[PDB]
Amino acid sequence: KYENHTVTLKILMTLRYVVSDILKESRYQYTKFNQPKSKFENLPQKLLLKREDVIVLQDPYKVNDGIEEDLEIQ
Amino acid sequence: AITSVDSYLLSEIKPRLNTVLENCYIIDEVLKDFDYQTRESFKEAFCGKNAQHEVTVGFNFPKFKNNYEAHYLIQLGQGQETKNSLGSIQSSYFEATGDTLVESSTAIREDDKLVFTVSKPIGELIKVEDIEFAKYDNLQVEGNKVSFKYQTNEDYENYNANIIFTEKKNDSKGLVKGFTVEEQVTVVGLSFNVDVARCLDAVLKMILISMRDSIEEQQTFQLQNLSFGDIAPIIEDGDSMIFGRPTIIKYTSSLDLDYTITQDINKLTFKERKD
């Protein structure tokens, strides 16, 4: 029916980001209190992200689990 | 046959460059002018089959990292139209012909003839090395082989020769439409050490000269015009700068297309006026 026509749409899409630069990359701490010995731990990084509009890839294929959500047990 | 100059540069450079760096004698001739210190340090690094360091080549805006110790970088550059022809016509051919090839072959002993065999149909022959076939030889082509008669040539049953020939595809005669394009392409060497860059540029100039003898260059890419820029810091936001001398290469080539003709006249009938 719409062989020669112009179709216009409004759509909802899932949000996506990619990493353009890493800001305040590595932050550190020699945690020692209440430990057998000194330990090194990496504190949170900060990321500068950009949205994917010029190139778009579909959402990743995640392996599903058979566990039913909101399951009642007894 | 639209010509991708950028691809041609890469095809020629990659094999020839490796061969030049492989041996030391040629490098000495190339770097004859340079001082002893720079000459040998470059040779110690890249020259020889046993060179740990190696040179690389690639196009601009790659998403990976290049070997900034030594690298050749290419970018397409401008293009312009310079000369036309009437009806945009270049040439007319009776046979659909592809590239022009050079092949080596040995003569084979047939009964009446000695024949050379080639990997593809011969189409148009151009030359067999240092043979001027006389009419009594009756030189002729057949499929993928070329033949000349045996008598008074009997010492040559084992003749080893090179052959220049064209790839034949079809018998469909057609015309050529196109024009000449004046194209410029940029080439630059990169390093974090200026001395390496100067040696690298000089090596490039030599292989450009050698390319003047190539089949593709002689037939398709003519009228070299080289232009060199000033040594500049390509990069400054880093632990050390990158230095490179850009060069500009100009070419003259044809952008051609094949137009096929089907109106072959074979019959011809004369009829007089009834009056």
Binding site: Y61, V63, N64, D65, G66, I67 | -
Partner: protein, 144 residues
């Protein structure tokens, strides 16, 4: 009858087959079928591939690591890949909900568990909680 499906019941067998290195095929609900594998070499870890079709001169399976969960294995259907038949051409697959009339002409809902056929392709179905067979026409698919 047709033996297109040979589901594995015990996960212990699955692990045993995995130790043998044979590829598995794990079903998913409203999602693409997947293949699972144990890596060769010194380090043993589970690998997965989204490529289902058979290995060929034009088609090579792509394998990558993953932290697969036993919960998917123990719950979802599992098969030996090479022994699996792609489909069983019947109107209502197994575990499909249908509405049927009982022997006393009273209507009840049921799900299907049977595979029987003559040599012409005529199929019969036996319903969960039922004994006798039911034809393709008698059963009616229950809409979601």
């Amino acid at each position: 009858p047709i033996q297109d499906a040979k589901p594995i019941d015990d996960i212990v067998d699955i692990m045993t087959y995995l130790k043998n290195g044979k590829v598995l095929r794990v079903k998913q609900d409203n999602q693409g079928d997947i293949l699972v594998r144990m890596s060769p070499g010194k380090h043993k870890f589970t690998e997965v591939s989204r490529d289902l079709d058979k290995e060929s001169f034009y088609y090579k399976r792509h394998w990558v690591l993953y932290n697969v969960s036993v919960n998917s294995l123990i719950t979802f259907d599992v098969y030996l890949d090479e022994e699996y038949s792609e489909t069983t051409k019947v109107k209502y697959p197994k575990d499909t909900i249908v509405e049927y009339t009982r022997e006393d002409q009273e209507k009840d809902v049921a799900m299907i568990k049977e595979i029987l056929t003559d040599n012409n392709g005529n199929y019969f179905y036996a319903l969960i909680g039922e004994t006798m067979l039911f034809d393709e026409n008698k059963l009616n698919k229950v809409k979601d």
